[PDB]
Enzyme design. Sequence first.
Site, short mmCIF file in Angstrom:
data_model
loop_
_atom_site.label_atom_id
_atom_site.label_comp_id
_atom_site.label_asym_id
_atom_site.label_seq_id
_atom_site.Cartn_x
_atom_site.Cartn_y
_atom_site.Cartn_z
N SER A 95 -5.28 12.56 8.70
CA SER A 95 -6.47 11.73 8.66
C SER A 95 -6.89 11.31 10.06
CB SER A 95 -6.23 10.48 7.81
OG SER A 95 -6.49 10.72 6.43
N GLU A 123 -9.38 -9.76 1.49
CA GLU A 123 -8.16 -10.54 1.28
C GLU A 123 -8.38 -11.86 0.55
OE1 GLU A 123 -5.29 -9.35 1.96
OE2 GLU A 123 -5.63 -7.81 3.47
N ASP A 130 0.98 -11.33 -3.09
CA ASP A 130 -0.03 -10.32 -2.79
C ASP A 130 0.05 -9.20 -3.83
OD1 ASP A 130 2.11 -8.61 -2.03
OD2 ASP A 130 1.62 -8.62 0.08
#
EC number: 3.2.1.17
Length: 162
Positions: free
Chosen positions: A117, A11, A20
């Site tokens: 997943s 980040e 972002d």
Amino acid sequence: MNIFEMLRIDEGLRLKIYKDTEGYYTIGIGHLLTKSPSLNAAKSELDKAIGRNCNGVITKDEAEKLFNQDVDAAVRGILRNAKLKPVYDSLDAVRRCAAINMVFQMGETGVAGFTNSLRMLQQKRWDEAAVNLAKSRWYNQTPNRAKRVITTFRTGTWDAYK
Ligand SMILES: Nc1ccc(CCCc2ccccc2)cc1
């Protein structure tokens, strides 16, 4: 390496409001302020988060305080989620960090996607899980970060962050 060093790599650190990767107003170490296009709305959210009048600028200490809170919130959300908690509990510590990383980036909105997943991760079918994780908007939009997180799930090592 630990979850704080991992997310600090992914980040970054910026002390003024920035957008972002999705174009949303953010500050600090990936602290999302709002999805509204209004900078004023973002500045209000920042002042509420810090408890003072900041006009879009914070210190490193304040960014790290939000970061500690945000990692804590990601963990607590995993533990409260009936689908995520059993998979998280089944993992080793390094792979738990990969899980926290994804929830930090995306919240819990992608749990129903990633059902397959999650099953592969619980079964410790690591190469299969890695293949499935990459078949995602997440991977296509942030591929370098997703590759690091996926390598962490695949190997149970920090190799992608060294
Ligand atoms: N938004 C979103 C939230 C969760 C996921 C699942 C993969 C990360 C994870 C793996 C194991 C336990 C907890 C979380 C995907 C997308």
